[PDB]
Amino acid sequence: GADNFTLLGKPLLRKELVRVEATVIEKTESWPKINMKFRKRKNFRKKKIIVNPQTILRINTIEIAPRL
Amino acid sequence: TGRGTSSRFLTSVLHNGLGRYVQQLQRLSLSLSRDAPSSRGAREFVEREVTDFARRNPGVVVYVNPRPCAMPRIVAEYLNGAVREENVNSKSVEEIKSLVQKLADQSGLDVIRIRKPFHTDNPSIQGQWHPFTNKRTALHGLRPRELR
Amino acid sequence: RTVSFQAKESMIRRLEVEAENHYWLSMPYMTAEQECGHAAERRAQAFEAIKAAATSKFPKHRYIADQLDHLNISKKWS
Amino acid sequence: TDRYWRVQEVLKHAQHFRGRKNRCYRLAVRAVTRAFVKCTKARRLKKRNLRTLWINRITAASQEHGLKYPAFIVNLIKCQVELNRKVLVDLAIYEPKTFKSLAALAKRRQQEGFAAALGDGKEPEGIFSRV
Amino acid sequence: VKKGFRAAFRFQKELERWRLLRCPPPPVRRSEKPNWDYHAEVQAFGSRLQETFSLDLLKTAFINSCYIKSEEAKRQSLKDNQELFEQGLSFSHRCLTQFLEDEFPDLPAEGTESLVSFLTGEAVVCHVARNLAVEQLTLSAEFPVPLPVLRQTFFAVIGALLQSSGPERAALFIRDFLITQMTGKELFEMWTVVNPMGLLVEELKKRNISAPESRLTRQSGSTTALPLYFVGLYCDRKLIAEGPGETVLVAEEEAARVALRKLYGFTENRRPWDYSKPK
Amino acid sequence: SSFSRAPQQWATFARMWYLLDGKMQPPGKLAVIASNKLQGLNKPVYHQLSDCGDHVVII
Amino acid sequence: TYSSLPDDYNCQVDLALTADGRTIVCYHPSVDIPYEHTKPIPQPDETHEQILKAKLEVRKSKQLEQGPMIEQLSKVFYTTKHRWYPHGQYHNRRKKLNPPRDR
Amino acid sequence: ISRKWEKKNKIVYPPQLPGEPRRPAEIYHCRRQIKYSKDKMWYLAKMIRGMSIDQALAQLEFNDKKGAQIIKEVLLEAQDMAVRDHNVEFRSNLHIAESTSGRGQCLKRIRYHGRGRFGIMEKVYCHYFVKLVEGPPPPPEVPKTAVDHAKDYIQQLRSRTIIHTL
RNA sequence: GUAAGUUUAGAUUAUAGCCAAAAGAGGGAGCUCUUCUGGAACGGAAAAAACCUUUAAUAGUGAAUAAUUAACAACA
């Protein structure tokens, strides 16, 4: 999108028209998530934690050209 | 648990990657014992992999202090002020190497639930919708039912 | 319980799809005679592997290194 | 000799409870487990609820332009547009001018779609209906 | 009496945890605390920034007048950072002003001064330095380091950096680390503008443009306790800027603010500043 | 666009007043429309907890 | 009149397929309200705070009682009286001291 | 048994620096063993909270409960030490900052009955805690007016942040 | 189409359902039995152990779908 105009892919724009670049900032994981399945006599020790990985990206530049 | 736990929004320390990426970890402290089964993996790590990590990352201050110690411990300090301690009790060389690499990649930012995975300082470009949007005007700005 | 219009259409679609299955099953490419023995070689080979795998159970070997490696637990700084 | 820490483990999760439940280990333990299960169950429904919210906002925005929600989605699909519902809400909120242009495309395709139905298929595909 | 030494030791740790929460220790600088090497940290500090610093000059920049007094007081019972401080502050003012002018040539000199002052404010400098661990590397006789002393070192380090790496590297450092702080900062947030209507007219007469005629474009809930008024400034019967407000005065004031941004090319949709340039 | 934060919030969250004529009009159809306007469902950013309902006047 | 939507309220919409046909381009220049369709500023020559104070007038028995005060507050804001009633200490302390704010 | 209330009177502050306001005096007084119910005594404590030394004493003089007489005696003892030991210049310049009662060690006996029944007899004892701050009682709170309520409500509405949005 | 099966030796545990739906027999309602088939949602039928859609369970602010309490006076 631009100030007064926009471009829509069908379903994607040509690679020449648009180039987008970003940078990786951090590699991290997810804060613990609690999983507990339902069962009779649940007990307190039937617990599992999920700490799946994570990563951070920072947008750097968006480039377009008059290649219509 | 979420009701009983805190949360934050997406944020960056000081826009680290805008100009150049800076490593948050600044100082590493290692305690070892000459004779201890718990430190065996750490003992071998110093022999082989400690040098490689230092060469790979020369900007982090590493302190290695072999001493009579019950449980070897690793302390990591970050630029933002975060300090993290990890026990090396009876951990293998491979486990130690992975942990240090993870510590270097991690930032001092708090690890809690993030409400929004997206942060933008200019969410709107064409203007935020308001009720007057798409409302047709009238000649002379006549309000409804105005006889004039 | 009066039947909803949506339910009737769904049942009709299932019947129509099944009708197409009937047609494509109405033209057997190979006759009965051709089918006989066409896969005999493959089936015989497969069973031989099954028999070999099934009858391969036995107790596992023991190695000196396992006993000797335990002594390494006492390694320390020089 | 560590039974105190076992009680503390339950207590830390039950500090925010109210009444004798928060201070009775018999009751606190039961509540802690129920809370954990409730959070686990909420994970599945939370995603579904968010999708419902996105659809509702799109319908309100679409109706303001005079376009029904099913028509907008179908026309966009016919236009080979693969924007997700969450992004569709985002464009309307922060890009009203773009959304109006998007509405025109859906409306224009709808007009061509109506013409195609009236045409009965004899007529060639419309300029905006070309794939 | 429960027997055992491990259990008794465990309770001692429990007591310590409660004691720490009840009575947090007084803050102390990392320099006094053990396992601190100034030389190693400076080398790591320079390497982390990917910048070349003259160790002697950098130490002088970190050295402060207050720090010397403590050493002299201890001595009774060394080069200041003033020279380096002036270079960084003076150079930064020119360089910071240069950044503002290039993007916004139309913006008046007075506005640039407000922007430069805000970007060079003690709080702004203090926030960057503290988050950069500069406080730990700062040499002073008091902890937490006083802000004016901290600000002196920040520009003093810039002066040392200029000698070590030249203006070009420092300018990129300033752009990468200081100009970044203006992201998300609106013009009037960083510049205090009173009487926008008068200022807007003053600019227009300079451009030989007629003063706009205010009109009420839209109104809602006028007689309610939550009224919304939209006021558009019409110049030569042409709307130049419109702003929302709760009262006509507020709406007119808000509309004037929008025009000032447009006059200086500070539109919200304006092209973002570039940190990409390696040159 | 380019408006200040607080005025933009005020305008977006402002409540509107609507007038309805009931002469020879079925209340049920009017009620359905009235519910949409009263609850604030007529806004693109409608939220359950935003208290975005609007005033409806029926004559 | 190629555009299928009115261009008179929000912005002019110009829809155009690209020559290659791989892209759809929308041009949306904003439209300003006509001068003739706007009202002038009030010609006759008061702060909202004064109006708010006047609305909650103190007339009877000097300061009115809590109930009437709530009713007067409720009438102004078209709210129920139940909303205005205070709450006990237990919940008041529970309120988070430092709520996060983003954008 | 714990006697931390007395230790609060043994706290010694560091010497005040020249740039420091004159520290107001704080006096803690308690009676550990009273043959009185804490619950009944609490009623007296709750009412007197925040009142002046003279006003509380005047009310106690005309009170019918036995506990009230004890409270006045406790108040007088605290006042005497305040001037004697805490360098209080004006006796009248005192107010009741805090007043509360606690449970004390009791005695257990069996309650006989004429028809062969028995009951649980208890001799109740209680503790009483009061903290006195030099100076007049703080001014009373002023209830919020309608205008104040409306302003906060508008402020609260503005403070609202959009939930679950981009 | 597919991968288990037979024999030899040692050895126990389980051996009491529930409801739905078919086939019979007592019977004449409904019941009382005998035989075959199926079931144990976090979806749906209003709440719904027994009916319908559903191969296990993992994180994600994605997507296509299944079942799915509703239905549209008479004379030549």
mmCIF file of C-alpha atoms in Angstrom, chain E:
data_model
loop_
_atom_site.group_PDB
_atom_site.id
_atom_site.type_symbol
_atom_site.label_atom_id
_atom_site.label_comp_id
_atom_site.label_asym_id
_atom_site.label_seq_id
_atom_site.Cartn_x
_atom_site.Cartn_y
_atom_site.Cartn_z
ATOM 1 C CA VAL E 1 13.020 -31.874 67.331
ATOM 2 C CA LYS E 2 13.432 -33.034 63.738
ATOM 3 C CA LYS E 3 16.864 -34.566 63.191
ATOM 4 C CA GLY E 4 19.215 -33.976 60.291
ATOM 5 C CA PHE E 5 21.492 -31.256 58.939
ATOM 6 C CA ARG E 6 20.171 -31.044 55.372
ATOM 7 C CA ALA E 7 16.683 -30.106 56.573
ATOM 8 C CA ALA E 8 18.080 -27.466 58.932
ATOM 9 C CA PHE E 9 20.246 -26.053 56.138
ATOM 10 C CA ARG E 10 17.224 -25.953 53.825
ATOM 11 C CA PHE E 11 15.277 -23.838 56.318
ATOM 12 C CA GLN E 12 18.204 -21.411 56.545
ATOM 13 C CA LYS E 13 17.870 -20.790 52.807
ATOM 14 C CA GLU E 14 14.134 -20.287 53.333
ATOM 15 C CA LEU E 15 14.880 -17.695 56.019
ATOM 16 C CA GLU E 16 17.345 -15.938 53.712
ATOM 17 C CA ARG E 17 14.762 -15.707 50.926
ATOM 18 C CA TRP E 18 12.247 -14.121 53.302
ATOM 19 C CA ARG E 19 14.928 -11.776 54.644
ATOM 20 C CA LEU E 20 15.885 -10.646 51.135
ATOM 21 C CA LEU E 21 12.266 -9.835 50.272
ATOM 22 C CA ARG E 22 11.683 -8.016 53.567
ATOM 23 C CA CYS E 23 14.964 -6.043 53.492
ATOM 24 C CA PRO E 24 16.366 -5.600 49.970
ATOM 25 C CA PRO E 25 20.062 -4.693 50.060
ATOM 26 C CA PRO E 26 21.147 -1.110 49.335
ATOM 27 C CA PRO E 27 22.153 -0.577 45.694
ATOM 28 C CA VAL E 28 25.874 -0.660 44.917
ATOM 29 C CA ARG E 29 27.712 -0.176 41.639
ATOM 30 C CA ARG E 30 29.100 -3.262 39.925
ATOM 31 C CA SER E 31 32.567 -1.680 40.080
ATOM 32 C CA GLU E 32 32.747 -2.104 43.859
ATOM 33 C CA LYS E 33 31.243 -5.590 43.734
ATOM 34 C CA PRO E 34 33.641 -8.486 43.048
ATOM 35 C CA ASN E 35 34.385 -10.044 39.665
ATOM 36 C CA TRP E 36 34.756 -6.664 37.940
ATOM 37 C CA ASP E 37 37.564 -5.871 35.489
ATOM 38 C CA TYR E 38 37.446 -2.364 34.038
ATOM 39 C CA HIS E 39 39.976 -3.160 31.305
ATOM 40 C CA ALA E 40 38.140 -6.308 30.210
ATOM 41 C CA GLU E 41 34.759 -4.558 30.240
ATOM 42 C CA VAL E 42 36.085 -1.650 28.169
ATOM 43 C CA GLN E 43 37.561 -4.072 25.634
ATOM 44 C CA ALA E 44 34.277 -5.989 25.590
ATOM 45 C CA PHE E 45 32.375 -2.692 25.462
ATOM 46 C CA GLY E 46 34.309 -1.586 22.387
ATOM 47 C CA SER E 47 34.061 -4.981 20.698
ATOM 48 C CA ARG E 48 30.324 -5.224 21.384
ATOM 49 C CA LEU E 49 29.724 -1.852 19.711
ATOM 50 C CA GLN E 50 31.857 -2.948 16.723
ATOM 51 C CA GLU E 51 33.615 0.409 17.096
ATOM 52 C CA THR E 52 37.240 1.438 17.590
ATOM 53 C CA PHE E 53 38.024 3.511 20.688
ATOM 54 C CA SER E 54 41.319 4.921 21.944
ATOM 55 C CA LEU E 55 41.595 3.247 25.344
ATOM 56 C CA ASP E 56 43.403 6.223 26.880
ATOM 57 C CA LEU E 57 40.886 8.709 25.478
ATOM 58 C CA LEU E 58 37.908 6.515 26.385
ATOM 59 C CA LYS E 59 39.120 6.235 29.981
ATOM 60 C CA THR E 60 39.451 10.022 30.140
ATOM 61 C CA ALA E 61 35.888 10.383 28.848
ATOM 62 C CA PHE E 62 34.628 8.024 31.555
ATOM 63 C CA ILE E 63 36.706 9.847 34.176
ATOM 64 C CA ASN E 64 34.622 12.523 35.891
ATOM 65 C CA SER E 65 35.425 15.519 38.066
ATOM 66 C CA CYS E 66 33.525 14.023 41.008
ATOM 67 C CA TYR E 67 35.475 10.768 40.715
ATOM 68 C CA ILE E 68 38.794 12.623 40.950
ATOM 69 C CA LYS E 69 37.728 14.400 44.146
ATOM 70 C CA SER E 70 37.056 11.067 45.854
ATOM 71 C CA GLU E 71 40.493 9.783 44.842
ATOM 72 C CA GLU E 72 42.080 13.068 45.925
ATOM 73 C CA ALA E 73 40.118 12.936 49.181
ATOM 74 C CA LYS E 74 41.318 9.363 49.680
ATOM 75 C CA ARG E 75 44.812 10.448 48.623
ATOM 76 C CA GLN E 76 44.749 13.322 51.119
ATOM 77 C CA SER E 77 43.762 10.988 53.966
ATOM 78 C CA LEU E 78 43.952 11.949 36.075
ATOM 79 C CA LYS E 79 42.274 13.902 33.265
ATOM 80 C CA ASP E 80 38.726 15.243 33.299
ATOM 81 C CA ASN E 81 36.182 14.583 30.554
ATOM 82 C CA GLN E 82 35.307 18.280 30.183
ATOM 83 C CA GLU E 83 37.461 18.713 27.075
ATOM 84 C CA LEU E 84 36.019 15.585 25.461
ATOM 85 C CA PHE E 85 32.542 16.445 26.757
ATOM 86 C CA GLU E 86 32.473 19.763 24.892
ATOM 87 C CA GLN E 87 33.472 18.173 21.579
ATOM 88 C CA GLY E 88 30.717 15.561 21.679
ATOM 89 C CA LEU E 89 28.003 17.971 22.790
ATOM 90 C CA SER E 90 29.051 20.646 20.297
ATOM 91 C CA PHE E 91 29.483 18.178 17.432
ATOM 92 C CA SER E 92 26.219 16.429 18.309
ATOM 93 C CA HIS E 93 24.305 19.716 18.161
ATOM 94 C CA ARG E 94 25.527 20.389 14.622
ATOM 95 C CA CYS E 95 25.077 16.770 13.540
ATOM 96 C CA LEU E 96 21.649 16.475 15.171
ATOM 97 C CA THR E 97 20.545 19.751 13.587
ATOM 98 C CA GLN E 98 21.868 18.485 10.253
ATOM 99 C CA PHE E 99 19.622 15.415 10.451
ATOM 100 C CA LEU E 100 16.495 17.473 11.113
ATOM 101 C CA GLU E 101 17.188 20.012 8.364
ATOM 102 C CA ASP E 102 17.760 17.451 5.603
ATOM 103 C CA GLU E 103 14.444 15.664 6.157
ATOM 104 C CA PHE E 104 12.496 18.852 6.978
ATOM 105 C CA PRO E 105 14.092 21.860 5.262
ATOM 106 C CA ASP E 106 10.790 23.721 5.589
ATOM 107 C CA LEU E 107 10.777 23.252 9.363
ATOM 108 C CA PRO E 108 11.941 26.481 11.053
ATOM 109 C CA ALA E 109 15.223 26.804 12.904
ATOM 110 C CA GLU E 110 13.307 27.327 16.153
ATOM 111 C CA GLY E 111 11.617 23.948 15.752
ATOM 112 C CA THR E 112 14.930 22.189 15.156
ATOM 113 C CA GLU E 113 16.255 23.706 18.386
ATOM 114 C CA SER E 114 13.340 22.210 20.320
ATOM 115 C CA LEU E 115 13.865 18.837 18.637
ATOM 116 C CA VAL E 116 17.622 18.971 19.246
ATOM 117 C CA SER E 117 17.097 19.985 22.876
ATOM 118 C CA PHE E 118 14.675 17.114 23.486
ATOM 119 C CA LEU E 119 16.982 14.567 21.850
ATOM 120 C CA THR E 120 19.894 15.919 23.917
ATOM 121 C CA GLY E 121 17.832 16.127 27.102
ATOM 122 C CA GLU E 122 19.335 14.776 30.299
ATOM 123 C CA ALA E 123 16.540 12.218 30.668
ATOM 124 C CA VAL E 124 16.931 11.081 27.054
ATOM 125 C CA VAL E 125 20.714 10.836 27.389
ATOM 126 C CA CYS E 126 20.401 9.213 30.818
ATOM 127 C CA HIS E 127 17.939 6.599 29.555
ATOM 128 C CA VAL E 128 20.189 5.592 26.649
ATOM 129 C CA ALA E 129 23.325 5.482 28.800
ATOM 130 C CA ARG E 130 21.744 3.446 31.602
ATOM 131 C CA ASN E 131 20.270 0.910 29.176
ATOM 132 C CA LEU E 132 23.703 0.724 27.509
ATOM 133 C CA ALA E 133 25.428 -0.255 30.799
ATOM 134 C CA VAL E 134 27.381 3.019 30.599
ATOM 135 C CA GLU E 135 26.520 3.693 34.246
ATOM 136 C CA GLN E 136 28.522 0.639 35.311
ATOM 137 C CA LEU E 137 31.399 1.825 33.111
ATOM 138 C CA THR E 138 31.031 5.413 34.347
ATOM 139 C CA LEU E 139 33.613 6.611 36.871
ATOM 140 C CA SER E 140 32.042 8.664 39.660
ATOM 141 C CA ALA E 141 32.115 9.095 43.429
ATOM 142 C CA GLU E 142 28.366 8.481 43.864
ATOM 143 C CA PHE E 143 26.049 5.605 42.966
ATOM 144 C CA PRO E 144 23.562 5.867 41.298
ATOM 145 C CA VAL E 145 25.620 8.134 39.031
ATOM 146 C CA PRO E 146 24.181 11.682 38.974
ATOM 147 C CA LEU E 147 22.477 12.426 35.671
ATOM 148 C CA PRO E 148 24.490 15.582 34.798
ATOM 149 C CA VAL E 149 27.718 13.655 35.376
ATOM 150 C CA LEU E 150 26.353 10.767 33.303
ATOM 151 C CA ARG E 151 25.397 13.159 30.499
ATOM 152 C CA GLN E 152 28.919 14.608 30.521
ATOM 153 C CA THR E 153 30.490 11.193 29.937
ATOM 154 C CA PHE E 154 28.063 10.312 27.138
ATOM 155 C CA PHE E 155 29.161 13.271 25.019
ATOM 156 C CA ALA E 156 32.729 12.837 26.280
ATOM 157 C CA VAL E 157 32.754 9.303 24.864
ATOM 158 C CA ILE E 158 31.492 10.771 21.586
ATOM 159 C CA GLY E 159 34.499 13.091 21.491
ATOM 160 C CA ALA E 160 36.844 10.161 22.071
ATOM 161 C CA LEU E 161 34.998 8.152 19.415
ATOM 162 C CA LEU E 162 35.467 10.963 16.890
ATOM 163 C CA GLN E 163 39.241 10.847 17.339
ATOM 164 C CA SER E 164 39.355 7.042 17.278
ATOM 165 C CA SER E 165 36.887 6.373 14.446
ATOM 166 C CA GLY E 166 36.321 9.792 12.864
ATOM 167 C CA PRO E 167 33.081 11.744 12.467
ATOM 168 C CA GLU E 168 31.677 9.288 9.918
ATOM 169 C CA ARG E 169 31.475 6.322 12.294
ATOM 170 C CA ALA E 170 30.175 8.513 15.123
ATOM 171 C CA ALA E 171 27.472 9.946 12.857
ATOM 172 C CA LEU E 172 26.309 6.422 12.024
ATOM 173 C CA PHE E 173 26.455 5.617 15.740
ATOM 174 C CA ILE E 174 24.332 8.690 16.476
ATOM 175 C CA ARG E 175 21.862 7.772 13.734
ATOM 176 C CA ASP E 176 21.740 4.115 14.777
ATOM 177 C CA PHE E 177 21.368 4.755 18.521
ATOM 178 C CA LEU E 178 20.044 8.309 19.030
ATOM 179 C CA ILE E 179 17.931 9.101 15.957
ATOM 180 C CA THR E 180 16.190 5.771 16.577
ATOM 181 C CA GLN E 181 14.626 7.245 19.723
ATOM 182 C CA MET E 182 12.489 9.601 17.607
ATOM 183 C CA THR E 183 10.492 6.679 16.190
ATOM 184 C CA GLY E 184 6.867 7.012 17.225
ATOM 185 C CA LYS E 185 7.467 10.575 18.447
ATOM 186 C CA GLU E 186 4.966 13.109 17.121
ATOM 187 C CA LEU E 187 6.134 16.604 16.227
ATOM 188 C CA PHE E 188 4.327 18.487 18.990
ATOM 189 C CA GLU E 189 5.372 15.808 21.482
ATOM 190 C CA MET E 190 9.025 16.789 20.985
ATOM 191 C CA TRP E 191 8.329 20.479 20.253
ATOM 192 C CA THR E 192 6.101 22.639 22.453
ATOM 193 C CA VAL E 193 3.872 24.818 20.257
ATOM 194 C CA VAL E 194 1.547 27.331 21.903
ATOM 195 C CA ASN E 195 -0.980 29.466 20.022
ATOM 196 C CA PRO E 196 -0.997 27.232 16.912
ATOM 197 C CA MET E 197 -3.587 29.440 15.203
ATOM 198 C CA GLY E 198 -1.302 32.469 15.371
ATOM 199 C CA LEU E 199 1.750 30.478 14.297
ATOM 200 C CA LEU E 200 -0.156 28.977 11.361
ATOM 201 C CA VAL E 201 -1.197 32.449 10.191
ATOM 202 C CA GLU E 202 2.392 33.658 10.570
ATOM 203 C CA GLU E 203 3.638 30.914 8.249
ATOM 204 C CA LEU E 204 0.837 31.527 5.742
ATOM 205 C CA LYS E 205 1.530 35.260 5.448
ATOM 206 C CA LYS E 206 5.192 34.428 4.837
ATOM 207 C CA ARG E 207 4.005 32.209 1.973
ATOM 208 C CA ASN E 208 1.586 34.980 0.892
ATOM 209 C CA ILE E 209 -1.456 32.808 1.634
ATOM 210 C CA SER E 210 -4.778 34.021 2.994
ATOM 211 C CA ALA E 211 -5.701 33.122 6.553
ATOM 212 C CA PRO E 212 -8.119 30.162 6.635
ATOM 213 C CA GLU E 213 -11.779 30.664 7.494
ATOM 214 C CA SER E 214 -12.875 28.201 10.166
ATOM 215 C CA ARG E 215 -16.036 26.183 9.543
ATOM 216 C CA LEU E 216 -17.834 23.364 11.360
ATOM 217 C CA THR E 217 -17.708 20.451 8.927
ATOM 218 C CA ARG E 218 -19.374 17.861 11.183
ATOM 219 C CA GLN E 219 -21.003 17.861 14.611
ATOM 220 C CA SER E 220 -22.465 15.209 16.903
ATOM 221 C CA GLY E 221 -23.983 15.327 20.373
ATOM 222 C CA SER E 222 -23.622 19.098 20.543
ATOM 223 C CA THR E 223 -25.949 19.513 23.537
ATOM 224 C CA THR E 224 -24.862 16.286 25.260
ATOM 225 C CA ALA E 225 -22.143 15.953 27.890
ATOM 226 C CA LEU E 226 -19.920 14.139 25.342
ATOM 227 C CA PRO E 227 -19.872 16.442 22.300
ATOM 228 C CA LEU E 228 -17.818 15.801 19.172
ATOM 229 C CA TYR E 229 -17.014 18.713 16.855
ATOM 230 C CA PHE E 230 -15.108 18.576 13.564
ATOM 231 C CA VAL E 231 -13.619 21.915 12.493
ATOM 232 C CA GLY E 232 -12.033 22.402 9.072
ATOM 233 C CA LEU E 233 -9.799 25.328 8.156
ATOM 234 C CA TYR E 234 -10.888 26.704 4.772
ATOM 235 C CA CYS E 235 -8.398 28.805 2.796
ATOM 236 C CA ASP E 236 -9.883 30.624 -0.200
ATOM 237 C CA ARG E 237 -12.985 28.492 0.436
ATOM 238 C CA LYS E 238 -10.750 25.395 0.212
ATOM 239 C CA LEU E 239 -10.230 23.057 3.161
ATOM 240 C CA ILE E 240 -6.540 22.851 4.071
ATOM 241 C CA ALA E 241 -6.702 20.905 7.348
ATOM 242 C CA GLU E 242 -9.380 19.450 9.616
ATOM 243 C CA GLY E 243 -9.087 18.313 13.215
ATOM 244 C CA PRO E 244 -11.359 16.600 15.740
ATOM 245 C CA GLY E 245 -12.155 18.069 19.122
ATOM 246 C CA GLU E 246 -14.650 18.023 21.953
ATOM 247 C CA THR E 247 -15.205 21.794 21.716
ATOM 248 C CA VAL E 248 -15.056 24.182 18.776
ATOM 249 C CA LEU E 249 -11.999 25.817 20.341
ATOM 250 C CA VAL E 250 -10.352 22.413 20.799
ATOM 251 C CA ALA E 251 -11.373 21.327 17.297
ATOM 252 C CA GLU E 252 -10.008 24.566 15.839
ATOM 253 C CA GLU E 253 -6.812 24.146 17.859
ATOM 254 C CA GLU E 254 -6.497 20.520 16.743
ATOM 255 C CA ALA E 255 -7.160 21.488 13.121
ATOM 256 C CA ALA E 256 -4.384 24.086 13.329
ATOM 257 C CA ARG E 257 -1.992 21.441 14.661
ATOM 258 C CA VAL E 258 -2.699 19.234 11.638
ATOM 259 C CA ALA E 259 -1.938 22.111 9.265
ATOM 260 C CA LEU E 260 1.376 22.830 10.993
ATOM 261 C CA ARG E 261 2.482 19.232 10.442
ATOM 262 C CA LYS E 262 1.420 19.471 6.795
ATOM 263 C CA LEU E 263 3.189 22.824 6.451
ATOM 264 C CA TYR E 264 6.440 21.291 7.727
ATOM 265 C CA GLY E 265 5.886 17.993 5.907
ATOM 266 C CA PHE E 266 5.305 16.002 9.108
ATOM 267 C CA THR E 267 2.352 13.971 7.841
ATOM 268 C CA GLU E 268 1.741 10.670 9.605
ATOM 269 C CA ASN E 269 1.999 8.862 6.251
ATOM 270 C CA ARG E 270 5.254 10.643 5.341
ATOM 271 C CA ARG E 271 8.234 8.553 4.274
ATOM 272 C CA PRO E 272 10.002 7.062 7.337
ATOM 273 C CA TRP E 273 13.573 8.109 8.091
ATOM 274 C CA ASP E 274 16.298 5.800 6.756
ATOM 275 C CA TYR E 275 18.713 3.943 9.021
ATOM 276 C CA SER E 276 19.591 1.594 6.141
ATOM 277 C CA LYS E 277 22.201 3.826 4.500
ATOM 278 C CA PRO E 278 25.721 2.470 5.170
ATOM 279 C CA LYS E 279 27.127 5.760 3.831
#
